[PDB]
C-alpha cells in the first residue's frame, strides 16, 4: 500500500512529500515499479501536480529517496502562471518511476528526468499519489534544446477508462484536449520571459504503440543508470531501498527520513491569481 509523508507546509521551501510503502519511505524515482501489470501495460504513475494548481512540484533527483519538492529558480519558489483560457496545469501531471531520459526523430537530447505523464481523467489527483494508468499516446516537446516526452494517460479507475484504448479515443471523448495540450506546453513559460516551445511531429500525438516503445526505451536507460552503468550519473541520487542488486541500495535510508510534520498550506502570493493573455 502506497501512502504519502508530508514534511512542512505546502507552498514553502521546506515542503517535501515522500512516498511510503507500508509506512516506510521509498524512492519515488527508483523504488516504485514502472509496471503495475506488465502483461497488460498498466503503469504506476507518480503524481506531482494536481490539475488546476500552479506550484511546480517535482520528484527531486538530487535528494535522497527523491521526495517531491517545489522547484526553485535562484532561490525563489516556482509557480506556472495562468495562461488564458487555462488555469494552472490542465492535466494531473507527473512522471513514470524507473524511467530516465538519458542526456547523452526529435534530434534533441534527453532531458535527464523521468518521462512526463499527463493523466486526463476526471478526478483531481494529489501530490505523491501512486495511481495506475494506461498509456494512450505520446507527444515530443522541444524545450531549450531538449526533448521532453509527454505520455498521455488515463487512470484505470476513471469511469471512461474502458472506452479509452488509443490516442484517437482522446479526440472522441475529450475533444479539444489535445489542442489545449499543444497550446499549453508551447506557451506556459512565456509569462516567465522564456521562449515559446515547439513540438516534434508538427504537434501530433503519436499512438499507444509509439508511446509504449518510448516508455520501454526510457525504462531500459533507467536500468543502466541504477545499475551504476551510465556514463554520467549527473548528481542524481540513486539511493534506493528495494533494489539490493544495485550499488546504491541502502535499507537505512527509510528510517533516516523525519516524521510527518504536516502543516496547513502556506499562502500563495496573490500575483499567482493573474490571468495572462499571451
Amino acid at each position: 500500500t502506497y501512502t504519502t509523508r508530508q514534511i512542512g507546509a505546502k507552498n514553502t521551501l521546506e515542503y517535501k512529500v515522500y512516498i511510503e510503502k507500508d509506512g516506510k519511505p521509498v524512492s519515488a524515482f527508483h523504488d516504485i515499479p514502472l509496471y503495475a501489470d506488465k502483461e497488460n501495460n498498466i503503469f504506476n504513475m507518480v503524481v506531482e501536480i494536481p490539475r488546476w494548481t500552479n506550484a511546480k512540484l517535482e520528484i527531486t533527483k538530487e535528494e535522497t529517496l527523491n521526495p517531491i519538492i517545489q522547484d526553485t529558480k535562484k532561490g525563489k519558489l516556482r509557480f506556472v502562471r495562468n495562461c488564458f483560457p487555462h488555469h494552472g496545469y490542465i492535466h494531473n501531471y507527473g512522471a513514470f518511476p524507473q524511467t530516465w531520459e538519458d542526456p547523452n526523430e526529435t534530434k534533441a537530447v534527453g532531458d535527464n528526468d523521468p518521462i512526463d505523464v499527463l493523466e486526463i481523467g476526471e478526478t483531481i489527483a494529489y501530490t505523491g499519489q501512486v495511481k495506475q494508468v494506461k498509456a494512450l499516446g505520446i507527444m515530443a516537446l522541444l524545450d531549450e534544446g531538449e526533448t521532453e516526452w509527454k505520455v498521455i494517460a488515463i487512470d484505470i479507475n476513471d469511469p471512461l477508462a474502458p472506452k479509452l484504448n488509443d490516442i484517437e479515443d482522446v479526440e472522441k471523448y475529450f475533444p479539444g484536449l489535445l489542442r489545449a495540450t499543444n497550446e499549453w506546453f508551447r506557451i506556459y513559460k512565456i509569462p516567465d520571459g522564456k521562449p515559446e516551445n515547439q513540438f516534434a511531429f508538427s504537434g501530433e500525438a503519436k499512438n499507444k504503440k509509439y508511446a509504449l516503445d518510448i516508455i520501454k526505451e526510457t525504462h531500459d536507460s533507467w536500468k543502466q543508470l541504477i545499475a551504476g552503468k551510465s556514463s554520467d550519473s549527473k548528481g542524481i541520487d540513486l539511493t534506493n531501498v528495494t533494489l539490493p542488486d544495485t550499488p546504491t541500495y541502502s535499507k537505512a535510508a527509510s528510517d533516516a527520513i523525519p516524521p510527518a510534520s504536516l502543516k496547513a498550506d502556506a499562502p500563495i502570493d496573490k500575483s499567482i491569481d493573474k490571468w495572462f493573455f499571451i
Copy 2:
C-alpha cells in the same frame, strides 16, 4: 468598512455569509449603496462567487438581511460543473446591490421578462475575489442572456484597484487587454447548464457586448425598479425580504434587525464531492 460574517462551513447547507458595516450585519441587497462614487459612476459590487470556483453562492432575496447562501436544486447544493476549457466560473461573479430586474413589467415588443434578481456583474480583474467582498468597480459594457425565458443582464466590470483599471474605460478596451475573454464569456453562459441537463442558453444581439453608455442606462433602470420595490410599491415583491438597516424612509427599516443575526461561527471548508472535479466536453 465592509467585512463578512460567516456562519458554518463553506460547501454546506448551513453556510451563510452576511455583509457587515462597522462590524454589524446590513442587507447585502438593500443597504450597500449602488454607487461608491456616483459622479464618476463607480459602483459597489457584491461578490458572490470567486473566479475558478463552482459553488453557486447567491445573495438570498427571501432571508432577512439577504445573506449569501449556496443555492439548491430540489434542496441539493448547487455546483456549476467544469465545462472544457473552463474551470468553474471564469469571472469574479456577483451583483450590484440596490438593483432589481422587475419580473412584473410587461415588455410586449421584446417579450423580455426580468429575472427577479439584482443585476449580475462579471468582474474581470486579475485578483481572485472572496464571497461577501464589496469591491468598487467601473462598468465597461453589458450583455443580455436569455435563460429559460428570463433576461439576465451581465455587466462587464473591473475593480478600480486592478493595475489595468486606468486603461479600461469602455467595452472595446476589454478586447485589447483581455483578448478572447468576451468570446469565452459568450461560450460560458451558453453552455454552463448543459451538464445539468438544461438547454444551451442564448444571447441577445448575437452575443455582442454593448458599451458603457448602454450599460449605465440598464443599470439605472434596475436601480429605479429597486427603488419602487424597497418603497413597498411593487405590484408583486415575490416574498423578497425588504428588511433594511439604512433606509429610514422605507416601511421595512429597522436598525435593530442587525442585532438579531447570530455571531460568526466560521468552520473550515467542508469537502466537496469529487464529482465536481469532472471536466465536461460539450462537443
